[PDB]
Write a protein that binds this ligand. Structure first.
Ligand SMILES: Nc1nc2c(ncn2[C@@H]2O[C@H](COP(=O)(O)OP(=O)(O)O)[C@@H](O)[C@H]2O)c(=O)[nH]1
Ligand SMILES: Nc1nc2c(ncn2[C@@H]2O[C@H](COP(=O)(O)OP(=O)(O)O)[C@@H](O)[C@H]2O)c(=O)[nH]1
Lengths: 280, 265
């Protein structure tokens, strides 16, 4: 098996914990029992994590979901991205001290965030300063996948316009989100990742915990008086694109960029701190 | 007959769409865009007067919006520009009562404030609590669950129960409605607070009958359908029915309390 750490960042009430439960088709979200789902908003940004082992035929994935309650939920959210960047850097510090592997384990314990989902609220306008300030600070140290939260709150015309608008803003602000084009292996990787950077992203996602029967078939979705949106239906939203990307295809590519780019940059920086290298 | 309506809320909560849905006019257009298109470096308060024929009867409607409210990383004191606008209109009326020759009285006090609540499905955000707790003694606040089509009937139901639980908890005083047929709409409103509204200016054919709503691939959210949202309850309680009672509470409660506080020093 292997480890995988995913982080969700966004304002409270964007479907973050519901989406995570849809990605992994399991109750892996931190909120799992009764009133624990109805949680109070902390006064500062707190970092919380929960661990689950997901087995898929010999592929024992050791999953850790990390959420950031209190982000963008205060009156004054100034510098609220710094506690999240601090957490990411200090997981690099854990790995930096353990890859020596004095314990001689076949697998070094990995707690670094391999994938960070940032949820953008569907406002129909341009991006918020909080959205920009977070990504331009964090895209340099983690893999950020931008998603549009609650995609069922937009029509086809609104959704196509909002995706273009966010995509143009991220390209104009030099925000290199995953998959970064610098790390395409070959032309086969450039071809598939251009379609993702230029069409499939931002993933307009919809999460749901409940199942309904729509014309004979059992489907995940949300039930409105006027109809039921099917979550795994590409004509309704783009959840399945996010799922085949993160889980089915680029799972390892996410961990590789984390190790060979972000962690290596941090490790090379730390070698030059505290007076520099020890004499040897 | 005049009326001053104020909308407060984040960008993208459908405020421009709901206002143009209530009055069936292009109050926000490419010429005078919505508040989300007029955001400056700091929070501003802007007004726009417009003439409306409501079923053959004219209406002098003044919309007051707050472009930039809640849209910044640091929203500290973003309510203060709204307080300054409302209290300066109270001072404008008090200086008119104290005139020697007070023949004609300009009344530009804000008679009603629609405060949009983002449809989290959880509760009220600290911004919502702090705003309503700082303006409920200065204006008639009517909380709205914006974009009600965001929530399923079950989510919206307990969302309402939570918002009222926190209204009552923080001792918030929202505008309440005071003929037994007039007491018929009061009972049907108290059980539906806060009103969850949907806005749209688009008409589409739904099984022959053309209804105004929002078309999704899986269904159509209908704006004038009481089983989809509370837009009808809002429009009936705002223009047709209790508009004058909103005007009277402003003069007799909030303006009288501003005066009693101003002159005490
Ligand atoms: N409209 C819509 N609502 C959703 C979606 N996913 C979840 N919700 C609702 O949003 C509310 C809060 O979502 P939650 O899972 O707690 O997200 P979180 O608080 O941001 O981590 C819940 O009542 C959900 O029913 C979605 O895709 N669309
Ligand atoms: N789901 C939903 N979307 C809406 C509603 N009202 C407006 N919108 C969409 O939200 C986007 C922005 O709405 P707008 O009125 O400009 O927001 P605001 O003026 O900043 O409050 C538009 O693209 C609308 O299509 C609503 O009631 N429900």
């Amino acid at each position: 098996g292997f480890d995988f750490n995913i982080m969700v960042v966004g304002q409270s009430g964007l479907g973050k914990s519901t989406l995570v439960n849809t990605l992994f088709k399991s109750q892996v979200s931190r909120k799992a029992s009764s009133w624990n789902r109805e949680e109070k908003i902390p006064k500062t940004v707190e970092i919380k994590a929960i661990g689950h082992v997901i087995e898929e035929g010999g592929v024992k994935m050791k999953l850790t979901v990390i959420d950031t309650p209190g982000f963008g939920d205060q009156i004054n959210n100034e510098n609220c991205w710094e506690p999240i960047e601090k957490y990411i850097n200090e997981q690099y510090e854990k790995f930096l001290k353990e890859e020596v592997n004095i314990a001689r384990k076949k697998r070094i314990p990995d707690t670094r965030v391999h994938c960070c989902l940032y949820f953008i609220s569907p406002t129909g306008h341009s991006l918020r300063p909080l959205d920009l300030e977070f990504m331009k600070h964090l895209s340099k140290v983690v893999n950020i996948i931008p998603v549009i939260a609650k995609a069922d709150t937009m029509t086809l015309e609104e959704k196509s316009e909002f995706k273009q608008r966010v995509r143009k803003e991220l390209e104009v602000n030099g925000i290199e989100f995953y998959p970064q084009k610098e790390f395409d292996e070959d032309l086969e990787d450039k071809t598939e990742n251009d379609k993702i950077r230029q069409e499939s992203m931002p993933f307009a996602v919809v999460g749901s915990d409940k199942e309904y029967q729509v014309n004979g078939k059992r489907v995940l979705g949300r039930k409105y008086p006027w109809g039921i949106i099917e979550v795994e239906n590409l004509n309704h939203c783009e959840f399945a694109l996010l799922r085949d990307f993160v889980i089915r295809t680029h799972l390892q590519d996410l961990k590789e960029v984390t190790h060979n780019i972000h962690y290596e940059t941090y490790r090379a920086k730390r070698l030059n701190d505290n007076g520099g290298l020890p004499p040897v | 007959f005049e009326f001053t309506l104020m909308v407060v809320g984040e960008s993208g909560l459908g405020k421009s769409t709901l206002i143009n849905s209530l009055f069936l006019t292009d109050l926000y257009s490419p010429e005078y865009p919505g508040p989300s298109h007029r955001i400056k470096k700091t929070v501003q308060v802007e007004q726009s007067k417009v003439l409306i024929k409501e079923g053959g009867v004219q209406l002098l409607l003044t919309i007051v919006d707050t472009p930039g409210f809640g849209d910044a990383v640091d929203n500290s004191n973003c309510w203060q520009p709204v307080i300054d606008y409302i209290d300066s209109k109270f001072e404008d009326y008090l200086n008119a009562e104290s005139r020697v020759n007070r023949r004609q009285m300009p009344d530009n006090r804000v008679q009603c404030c629609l405060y949009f609540i983002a449809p989290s499905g959880h509760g009220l955000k600290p911004l919502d609590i702090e705003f309503m707790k700082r303006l409920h003694e200065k204006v008639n606040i009517i909380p709205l669950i914006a974009k009600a089509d965001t929530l399923t009937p079950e989510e919206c139901q307990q969302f309402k129960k939570q918002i009222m639980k926190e209204i009552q908890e923080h001792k918030i005083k929202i505008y309440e409605f005071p003929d037994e047929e007039e007491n018929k709409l009061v009972k049907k409103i108290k059980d539906r607070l806060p009103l969850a509204v949907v806005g749209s200016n688009t008409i589409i054919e739904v099984n022959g009958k053309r209804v105004r709503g929002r078309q999704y691939p899986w269904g159509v959210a209908e704006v004038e359908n009481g089983e989809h949202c509370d837009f009808t309850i809002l429009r009936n309680m705002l223009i047709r029915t209790h508009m004058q009672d909103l005007k009277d509470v402003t003069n007799n409660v909030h303006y009288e309390n501003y005066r009693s506080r101003k002159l005490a020093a």
